[PDB]
């Protein structure tokens, strides 16, 4: 007598006509050195790739995402959209344009009448080939991710923290610290993000 | 490409590392939390009625082990039994236990263990049941009750005569 | 405990089993380790505790029979390997099938052995002070054991 539940109903989720990813025009230091302030919200879709570091996404990566994602998605049941602008930052030996991305940004978003488990594999595969570290996160997973971060700070049993020592100049520490370190609070070093750092 | 940090900064990072709170006792080693009130899925309640219905409707309930015979061969047995207006019933044992625990039939619990099939009808064509049983030699009979009387296979054979 | 006897006719006879010491110090413990307050207080040296979960020929008993939790089943399994490799279980040696004798090669004394000596390769480039290659001692599974030292145990030697 195996128990069962009603299948999750995605009937509310309508399907955009242009479900497939659009094309991206190849031709239209701090950009990747801090926490992002854009694209951090899911919006329409429920599944997206989360940038866990700072990196530049040039046109080559755009095509790889485009081609891979487009092929497997079902037009009847799935759709996707882009959450970052097209390449605009000049690069010279004006060889090409690279789109900057900050840690925490959602590179691409997916949605439709599909479960996360269905979209887990391809998004993880696509993420792996992105220049910076990335991950596939559903709406719940990103929420859980933030909740664990806040939970860690509250229940931390270490009296000393980077913020308090840095702000109060305890130990004369600011001799060895950058002005930006006070804002970051030790979470971010260069273009790298340290999740375990509270 | 990581750039080496000043040693003083590295000392600062080491001392400000997150420390988690540690419980004194593992939750697993501790007694398990009591189960909350369960929810009956719409499989046991409906099937419960079916078990109630079959007992109420059928005066004779005889039990035989499931033989794992091909369904293509179950059909002919069902068709053969249908021609004799004798029906077959199969139910999950675990939800059958509570009724058999508290019902007119309570000594049949050992019979209702494992894969099984139920012989149900309205007429005691018990002798013909052996003939239907004799049609397939390997299928055995475990026992049950006929005409509201609980008896074993050897007793059933004498009762059949 | 049931034993099979053959005669062909073969039958199994059930025998009475030695009983556990009654009244555990800590009732309500699921695992038999916690009903006696042994969670973090046994090591490979404790043959008396370890031997109880071992088959006569040195194999570990299945978890569903011992009743240990997974966390403690793995610790017992690892402690038993280290105990065997230390020569602390001379009477649980492997059975010799037929026409087989012990290797007769002299036995090296070892203890706290994480890996099987057969498959561990020599460290030919040991490294300098800060790139030193470490020789693992003990098991990571026992990292939570009670420590009576000022500093944590030195796993990497």
């Amino acid at each position: 007598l195996k128990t069962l539940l009603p299948v999750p109903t995605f009937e509310n989720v309508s399907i955009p006509e242009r479900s497939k990813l659009k094309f991206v025009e190849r031709v239209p230091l701090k950009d990747i050195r801090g926490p992002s302030t854009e694209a951090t919200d899911f919006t329409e879709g429920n599944f997206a790739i989360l940038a866990l570091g700072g990196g530049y996404l040039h046109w080559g990566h755009f095509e790889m995402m485009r081609l891979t994602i487009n092929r497997f998605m079902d037009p009847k049941n799935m759709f996707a959209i882009w959450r970052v602008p097209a390449p605009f930052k000049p690069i010279t030996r004006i060889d090409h344009y690279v789109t900057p991305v900050k840690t925490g940004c959602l590179v691409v978003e997916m949605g439709g009448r599909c479960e996360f488990e269905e979209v887990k594999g391809i998004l993880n595969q696509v993420a792996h080939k992105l220049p910076f570290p990335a991950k596939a996160v559903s709406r719940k997973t990103l929420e859980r991710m933030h909740q664990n971060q806040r939970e860690r700070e509250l229940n931390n049993q270490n009296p000393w923290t980077f913020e308090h020592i840095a702000t109060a100049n305890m130990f004369g520490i600011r001799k060895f610290l950058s002005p930006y370190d006070l804002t970051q609070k030790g979470r971010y070093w260069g273009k790298f993000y340290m999740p375990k750092r509270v | 490409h990581w750039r080496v940090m000043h040693f003083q900064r590295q000392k600062l990072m080491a001392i400000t590392e997150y420390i988690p709170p540690k419980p004194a006792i593992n939750p697993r080693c501790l007694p398990p939390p009591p189960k909350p009130p369960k929810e009956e899925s719409g499989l046991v309640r409906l099937l419960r009625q079916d078990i109630v219905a079959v007992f109420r409707d059928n005066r004779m309930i005889a039990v035989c082990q499931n033989v794992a015979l091909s369904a293509e061969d179950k059909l002919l047995l069902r068709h053969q039994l249908r021609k004799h207006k004798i029906f077959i019933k199969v139910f999950p044992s675990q939800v059958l236990k509570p009724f058999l625990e508290n019902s007119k039939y309570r000594n049949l619990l050992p019979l209702f263990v494992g894969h099984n099939l139920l012989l149900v009808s309205e007429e005691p064509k018990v002798k013909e049941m052996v003939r239907v049983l004799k049609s397939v030699p390997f299928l055995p009979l475990l026992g049950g009750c006929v005409d509201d009387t609980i008896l074993s296979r050897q007793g059933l054979v004498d009762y059949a005569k | 405990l049931r034993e099979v006897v053959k005669i062909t006719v073969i039958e199994g006879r059930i025998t009475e089993t030695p009983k556990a010491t009654p009244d555990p110090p800590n009732p309500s413990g699921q695992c038999p380790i916690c009903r006696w307050n042994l969670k973090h207080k046994y090591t490979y040296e404790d043959v008396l505790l370890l031997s109880q979960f071992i088959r006569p020929y040195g194999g570990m008993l299945p978890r569903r029979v011992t009743g240990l939790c997974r966390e403690e089943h793995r610790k017992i399994e690892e402690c038993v390997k280290m105990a065997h490799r230390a020569g602390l279980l001379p009477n649980h040696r492997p059975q010799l099938p037929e026409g087989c004798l012990p290797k007769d090669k002299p036995k090296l004394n070892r203890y706290l052995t994480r890996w099987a000596p057969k498959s561990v390769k020599p460290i030919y480039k040991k490294g300098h002070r800060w790139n030193k290659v470490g020789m693992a001692v003990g098991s990571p599974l026992l990292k939570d054991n009670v420590c009576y030292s000022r500093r944590p145990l030195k796993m990497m030697h």
């Binding site: 000393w160 130990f171 | 590295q10 | -």
Partner: peptide, 27 residues
């Protein structure tokens, strides 16, 4: 460079001394 055990404690001891210095300058 992993930070030594003794190095970590000596910094903490100094931090506590300065932490008290905060209290006595607040009145």
């Amino acid at each position: 460079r992993t930070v030594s055990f003794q190095a970590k404690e000596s910094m903490i001891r100094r931090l506590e001394v300065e932490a008290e210095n905060h209290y006595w300058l607040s009145m």
